[PDB]
Amino acid sequence: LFGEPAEGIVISRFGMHADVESADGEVHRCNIRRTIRSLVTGDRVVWRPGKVKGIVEAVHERTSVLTRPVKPIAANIDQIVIVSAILPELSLNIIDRYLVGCETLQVEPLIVLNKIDLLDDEGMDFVNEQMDIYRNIGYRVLMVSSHTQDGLKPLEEALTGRISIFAGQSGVGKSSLLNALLGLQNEILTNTAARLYHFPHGGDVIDSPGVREFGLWHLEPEQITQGFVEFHDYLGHCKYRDCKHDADPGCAIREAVENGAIAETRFENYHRILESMA
């Protein structure tokens, strides 16, 4: 016999159980109704307290769902923070692949360039010019340094009121940034393991090895194309209705690249991504 229903969010999925944070902040380890087809960290739930192990009664519809190449690992992500760094490698192709992933999942991306402390004036100007590629197509870019904490404040402001994950290649400083931001004292990131944490100034983050390894699954060409937001306005304006936007005569996208309206690396990476699929 249980009590009154209440809202909650899944902090972590214990395989057979789940730790649900109630709308009042208290965490309760709960069982899961057999009728629940799937429950993952980030799910918004209707639960009831036991009269101390409560029970999950239902799961609200997910605004988004993160999956592994097609099983859900996390739910209700609002923003994926794409983290890069000068070292070990600043890859525009990696960033572009992630952005395609964001557009496909329909979650807003946040491009973070970490380790700016490793650059001098000339280094800074170069990196900023690179990031302008992204600023110019509407994405917000943040220059930061975990070690110096520079730019960390605007990052917190961009994290508040949202549920994020930190995606990026190894060594860019994900664990470093998260530790600096979370200020954990009695927990440690795993440096079904996905767990959500609360940032001091608002907003949450779901983390674990798999989440950070957020990869791009098999996508159809059209999905890749939609994955480049600056392409949208040119679609339907190519000479051929079925223009593949490669060497096709009169391609509006390619010409835009040749005029400077679209960045060359974006077009180039668009094709590289297209190729690595099928």
Ligand X SMILES: Nc1nc2c(ncn2[C@@H]2O[C@H](COP(=O)(O)OP(=O)(O)O)[C@H](O)[C@H]2O)c(=O)[nH]1
User: From residue 123 to residue 162, what is the string marking binding to ligand X with x (rule CB under 6 A)?
Assistant: ----------------------xxx---------------
Q: Distance between CA 236 and CA 230 in Å, rounded?
A: 13
Q: Distance between CA 59 and CA 238 in Å, rounded?
A: 45
Would you say 167 or 238 has its CB closer to Zn ion? 238
Map residue 94 onto helix, strand or coil: helix
Stretch in the footprint of Zn ion (CB under 5 A) among 54-62, 200-208, 232-240, 261-269: 232-240
Full 3-state SS string of 229-270: HHHHHHCCCCCCCCCCCCCCCCCHHHHHHHHCCCCHHHHHHH
Q: Please tell me whether 114 is known to bind a ligand.
A: yes
Q: Which of residues 256-275 bind Zn ion (CB under 5 A)?
A: none
Phi-psi region for residue 161, left (φ > 0), alpha (ψ -120 to 50) or beta?
Answer: left
We find the least distance from the C-beta atom of residue 123 to ligand X, in angstroms, to be 12
Q: Among 26, 89, 117, 220, which residue sits at the site for ligand X (rule: CB under 6 A)? A: 117
We find the least distance from the C-beta atom of residue 197 to ligand X, in angstroms, to be 15
We find the least distance from the C-beta atom of residue 94 to Zn ion, in angstroms, to be 25
Q: Distance between CA 99 and CA 228 in Å, rounded?
A: 8
We find the least distance from the C-beta atom of residue 230 to ligand X, in angstroms, to be 28
Q: Distance between CA 42 and CA 92 in Å, rounded?
A: 30
Tell me which residues touch ligand X (CB under 6 A).
114-115, 117-118, 145-147, 168, 170-176
Which positions touch Zn ion (CB under 5 A)?
Answer: 238, 243, 245, 251, 253
